Amino acid sequence: RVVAHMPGDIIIGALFSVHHQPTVDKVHERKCGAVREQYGIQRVEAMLHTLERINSDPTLLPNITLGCEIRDSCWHSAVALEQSIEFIRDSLISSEESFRSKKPIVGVIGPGSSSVAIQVQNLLQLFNIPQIAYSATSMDLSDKTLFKYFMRVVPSDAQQARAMVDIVKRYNWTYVSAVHTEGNYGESGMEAFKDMSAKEGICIAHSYKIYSNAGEQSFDKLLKKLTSHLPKARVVACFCEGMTVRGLLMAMRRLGLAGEFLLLGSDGWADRYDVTDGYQREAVGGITIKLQSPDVKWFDDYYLKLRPETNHRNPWFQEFWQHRFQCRLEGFPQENSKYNKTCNSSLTLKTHHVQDSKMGFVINAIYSMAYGLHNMQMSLCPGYAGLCDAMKPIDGRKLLESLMKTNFTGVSGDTILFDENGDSPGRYEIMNFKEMGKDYFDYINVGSWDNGELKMDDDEVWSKKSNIIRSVCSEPCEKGQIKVIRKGEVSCCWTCTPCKENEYVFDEYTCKACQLGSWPTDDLTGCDLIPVQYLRWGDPEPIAAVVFACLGLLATLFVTVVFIIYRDTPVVKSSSRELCYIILAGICLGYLCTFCLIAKPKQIYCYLQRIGIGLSPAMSYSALVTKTNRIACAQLVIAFILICIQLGIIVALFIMEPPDIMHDYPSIREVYLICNTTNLGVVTPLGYNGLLILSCTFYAFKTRNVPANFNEAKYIAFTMYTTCIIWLAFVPIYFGSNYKIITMCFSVSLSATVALGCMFVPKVYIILAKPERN
Amino acid sequence: RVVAHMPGDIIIGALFSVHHQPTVDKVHERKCGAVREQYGIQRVEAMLHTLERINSDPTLLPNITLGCEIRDSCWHSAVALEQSIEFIRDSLISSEESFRSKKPIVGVIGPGSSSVAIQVQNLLQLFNIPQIAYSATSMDLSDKTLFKYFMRVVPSDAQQARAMVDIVKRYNWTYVSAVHTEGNYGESGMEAFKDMSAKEGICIAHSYKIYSNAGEQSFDKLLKKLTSHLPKARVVACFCEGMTVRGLLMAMRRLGLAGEFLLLGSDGWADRYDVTDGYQREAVGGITIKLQSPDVKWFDDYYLKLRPETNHRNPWFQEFWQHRFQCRLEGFPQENSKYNKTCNSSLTLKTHHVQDSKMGFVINAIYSMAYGLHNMQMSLCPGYAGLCDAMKPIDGRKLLESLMKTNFTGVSGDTILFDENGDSPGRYEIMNFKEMGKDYFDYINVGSWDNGELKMDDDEVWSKKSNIIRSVCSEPCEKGQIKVIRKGEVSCCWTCTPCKENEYVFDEYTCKACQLGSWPTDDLTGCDLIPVQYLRWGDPEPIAAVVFACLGLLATLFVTVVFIIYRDTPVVKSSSRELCYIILAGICLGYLCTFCLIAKPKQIYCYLQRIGIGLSPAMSYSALVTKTNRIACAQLVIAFILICIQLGIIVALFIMEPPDIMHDYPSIREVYLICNTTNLGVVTPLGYNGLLILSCTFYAFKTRNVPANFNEAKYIAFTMYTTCIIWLAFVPIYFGSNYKIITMCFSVSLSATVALGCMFVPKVYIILAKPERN
Ligand SMILES: *[C@@H]1O[C@H](CO)[C@@H](O)[C@H](O)[C@H]1NC(C)=O
Ligand SMILES: *[C@@H]1O[C@H](CO)[C@@H](O)[C@H](O)[C@H]1NC(C)=O
Ligand SMILES: *[C@@H]1O[C@H](CO)[C@@H](O)[C@H](O)[C@H]1NC(C)=O
Ligand SMILES: *[C@@H]1O[C@H](CO)[C@@H](O)[C@H](O)[C@H]1NC(C)=O
């Protein structure tokens, strides 16, 4: 086993993926693969020069030299576990005390794979050793109930899903499709995405849990299933890997459905143009995310000046010079005979210098542990250059307490701050694969994201407002009368359903209905009451009844001259001078019933309208049948008792029925203004009227041969044969249409006008028209 | 560091609590405590002699020597973790390859504490090393989703709670109280107990989460809160430790409430008479549980023959001889000067030989790994004495597969079988602290439990059937009429609520009600229909109507002699000979209405009863008013038309009302048998009868001065003044009580009998009684 070592006071180890992973036949022999350049030796020399800088910077840890013990991880779980066993036994022999030098391992950094770091944490919890990673992105590692000693200077995939939710939230897109690859990277990220999409109502058609190496027929079936949701969903969010997006683009070329689907993605194709290699006509318009990766000139100047004759601190730098430049440095102690060519002295290092994209994150973690130890020194050893007895030795409980509450500016100047879950906030970059002038598109920048701060250039993409259409299931309905209704599939496939004419829009998926006599406004906001009728205007239908009542009241005073002044003429002396007066008064009240009925409906006017309908034919017929019965001192008594019968009947009716003003409801849009007119109160005086008129007809048919009072009985019979038709035809016309005022003002005045013009007008025809018997 | 080592082919380590646990000032210096005799060196020598026996037994692993590497655990988590780091680096240097001997650690046994084994498993999962414990009882360790490489030859606390549920289930106890101490032993066991008690409806008053070192005032408050549930709950189940039970007994002595509470417990006071030390008057009757602990003579014979001059294999046996017998063996290499006295040569070892109670479980785990390796040898190296290339090397995946499906007989002969959770089933012992003849009680055996097999001696405890009363909230209710009802607190505090007289017991907490005309049986099982009345017996109330109808039918033929035979006498020649015949026929039908009404209600009999009630006074009165009107060829026509009027009326009634047989419901317990008798069908013939009788009375009052037919009109008027009272008083008596058959059979026959005896009997009084005008 090899180790790169730095001496010092506090030694902080690391696990870097120097070699490639071993195969299935090397899991027991631990034969690691070839040396990985970017993830490996670059991070090693970066940590070496970073601790050389931190030992040379007296701002933090002034009289404390921070050494290191760099051991390989080989990208595999078991080898990293073996080197962590080496770390912990070095810590234990330092605690207890050939190679008697002690080295208490305090912290350790790495490795890259989250599937390996999740194994390393289960070893490091037991030993009070905190560990800060730089490439683990799995969100289950945030659970410090299980993973207490795991901290990250990188954001999780949950904050990738957060930004993927936020960019859709900014673009007002609701019914979208989203796929994800199999594994802990895809599944957890899609779970966080669908958990945060429900906070904005963003619908998901169907998640397609595809595999990392699915077949071309399987990818074509997934593309057909995605097209089955089109055109209702256009944006496809793939929290997935780069080979997933490459297989989807292979399916888009093999299906020929390019230029339609919008492909949102995670950092699997962040700068990976090899995913869109040769697929630039199909990949256009896609939006991905990427961590901010600034290039640090510190490691550049510290790394381009390295030579194998100088860099003897790294025990595999000479092997890296041997294998990576494919030459045989025979003077080097790592002189391998596998390379046939020799190493020239002018063989430079600046050729193809492409450093790690995650280079700044390693230095961020190193400075995180550095300022954590500086906070420990400032908290426990106040005003001291080195370390006092409170830091002799150092366990990880108060070290975790110090690292949890740290804050500084990194190599990018980023304010590195740790939450309660021990995670740095996300600071991403947003790009587009927009087409250039020629047929060569690139991942061009369209802005960035930082913890909610979503700086975007909407004018950059589509070059206008003519974007991809809003991926939504239901359009917004016509909110004046039509309302939405859920079908039962998603929260955005609403159905534009109109509501009733008496139902206003109250809820977003329901209409409340107005009550009887109420109907909504023009915006379906509330309700409005329909107005009622005053029933007194120049309306041509009741004005005939008004003119007819005026003619009756004029004819009353026309008749009233030739017997009140002529009260001594023997034509009227033999006639009944009180009974005909009572009959004329009843006819006058029957004329006044027209004015009492066609008026304003009030608490007194309805009672004054309803008191006369029973009485005015009754007192007109009572004196008539009283005079008819005698065909010697009860002449004003029998008719008075017959009037008092109907008086008692109408008083007993009005005791049971108080005067009320109701509203007739012929429909939902018409509200009238009626009185307290019940069927009992209609029929009960009609029964007494029918009892009077049949007895009067039976008496007139018997006494129709009385010539007295200048043919009085003939005129009586001629009046009664007309009234027996009128008071019989009154019933169906009143019980038919809604003319309960109009027919009432017509027919009662008509009956009184007949009882005038066929009884009293022929009685004065031999008086006024014939002045011989005035 | 020290280690006890056995050479061999397959080396299986162990972690035994040899020393006592270090203090708070020795967690960094690892200064372990004094040597623990029972849990420590006894288990060490047991494993040494057990592997010596297994190497000498050619039944399993014939040409394989099973060595060991015994390292201390010191009862503390960190020291056991350090020695496990030593184990895994020994495994790694054996995998890779001064002291160049390799030793691949395959399995490891222990330690005792579950709180330490839960730390050791998080280290051993990462390395494919299975581990079998012998004292860990925590039930969260059964979760092999998290704890895949942890197996037990001991049952969990869940199977303690299972037996504590089962003994209560056998004793039919429902509303009990249960307390538990704080910690993972008490809390998980109480959670499993309350989870399994809900499978039997066993109520729990309130769990009292007390602490291990609660105050005496706190224990008195807990005792008062437990007495607050008394006497409704008597048995107290304490899945707790021994100091908990000792504190509860201190509270019982300080409160003086002894001799009442039943104390069920776990193995915290299994053989711990120090809990009940001096508390034997208060602790009587309590039931605890204990694992079966047989004494193995193998370790006895292998351990009593040990000497420090011989046992040089154990590197701390000489220190155990130094400290445990408090003498200074100066010739021994562990000659400590702390002991002033010297070691005699006759100083024996058999004095106070009290071995471990869990001694057999260690040997069970050793034989479990032995037969697992034997199953591996039989599965991978068939017919081979040693090990083939399939067992070179050996990881723990297929070793776990072999250990999961093992079965053998242990040192006690117990069939050790592992479930899907990797746990041995429980095989307990049940004891009681029953009083002896003197005042010295002991933990006497009352049976055992083995995976459901609950062998108990009920005659042993209480010496009779007079036991502790069943701890229940509600007694079983009187199930004849009274039903239970839940109050809303527990599933056993039911309230004995009676139900209605028409409601039968259907549910255990609800009564279903019978319908109208139905009422339950004597056991409230279903419903029963009430019988109806036939209304024809020797009942004294309708038999008067029957005798009266017979007298009427006799008087009909009494009258029918003196005018049918005497059809030429001029007394009856001037009288109406057809009209009086029609009247007599109507009286005969009115007499027949009594027989038609008081009969069996059928579809024809109800119609025949209801056809005559309208017709029989109508045809009797029609000829009467027809003869009365003439006071010349329509004499049989006018009365016929008046009969046909009522005929048409009753046909129009029976068209609207078909003949139906209904059931009168005067109450919920009485169902009668009536016909289709509606109020319309009652009033409508009564109106025609009233129209007839008033016209007949008005005609008789005018024609009461007609002396013809030997004073006929006087008898007519005298009949009519009686019928005007009868047919007017018929209405309230019929509209009052439930005599709709009785009054109908009375009054119609009474009216016909009056119309006979005041009209025709005086008409024949001058015929039969006076034979001069026969
Ligand atoms: C919703 O997002 C679209 C994105 O193109 C934008 O044009 C529109 O103005 C947004 N709606 C509102 C109300 O801002
Ligand atoms: C880190 O953040 C906290 C709160 O956000 C602030 O009080 C502190 O000053 C910051 N650290 C530095 C070095 O500014
Ligand atoms: C428990 O209940 C069963 C059910 O009837 C009964 O047979 C048994 O005798 C009961 N046991 C005791 C101890 O009451
Ligand atoms: C162990 O149990 C299984 C099933 O219960 C049985 O088939 C097997 O024979 C048993 N082992 C022995 C040694 O009897």
From Swiss-Prot, chains A, B:
The keyword Membrane applies. It is found in: Cell membrane. GO terms for molecular function: A2A adenosine receptor binding; adenylate cyclase inhibiting G protein-coupled glutamate receptor activity; G protein-coupled receptor activity; G protein-coupled receptor activity involved in regulation of postsynaptic membrane potential; glutamate receptor activity; identical protein binding; neurotransmitter receptor activity involved in regulation of postsynaptic cytosolic calcium ion concentration; protein tyrosine kinase activator activity. Disulfide bonds join 32-74, 203-492, 238-240, 327-343, 381-388, 473-493, 477-496, 499-511, 514-527, 606-675. Keywords: Cell membrane, Disulfide bond, G-protein coupled receptor, Glycoprotein, Membrane, Methylation, Phosphoprotein, Receptor, Signal, Transducer, Transmembrane, Transmembrane helix. GO terms for cellular component: astrocyte projection; cytoplasm; dendrite; dendritic shaft; dendritic spine; glutamatergic synapse; neuronal cell body; plasma membrane. Residues 1-542, 599-606, 657-679, 738-740 are extracellular. GO terms for biological process: cellular response to amyloid-beta; chemical synaptic transmission; cognition; desensitization of G protein-coupled receptor signaling pathway; G protein-coupled glutamate receptor signaling pathway; learning; learning or memory; locomotory behavior. Residues 566-575, 702-714 are cytoplasmic. Glycans are attached at residues 63, 172, 340, 344, 407, 676. The chain crosses the membrane at residues 543-565, 576-598, 607-629, 636-656, 680-701, 715-737, 741-762. L-glutamate binds at residues 39, 114, 135-137, 185, 267, 358. Changing residue 576 to D: Decreased constitutive signaling activity. It is a multi-pass membrane protein. The PPXXF motif binds HOMER1, HOMER2 and HOMER3. Interacts with SIAH1, RYR1, RYR2, ITPR1, SHANK1, SHANK3 and TAMALIN. Interacts with NCDN. Isoform 2 interacts with NECAB2. Interacts with CAMK2A. G-protein coupled receptor for glutamate. Ligand binding causes a conformation change that triggers signaling via guanine nucleotide-binding proteins (G proteins) and modulates the activity of down-stream effectors. Signaling activates a phosphatidylinositol-calcium second messenger system and generates a calcium-activated chloride current. Plays an important role in the regulation of synaptic plasticity and the modulation of the neural network activity. Belongs to the G-protein coupled receptor 3 family. This is Metabotropic glutamate receptor 5. The gene is GRM5. The chain holds residues 26 to 832 of 1212 of the full protein.
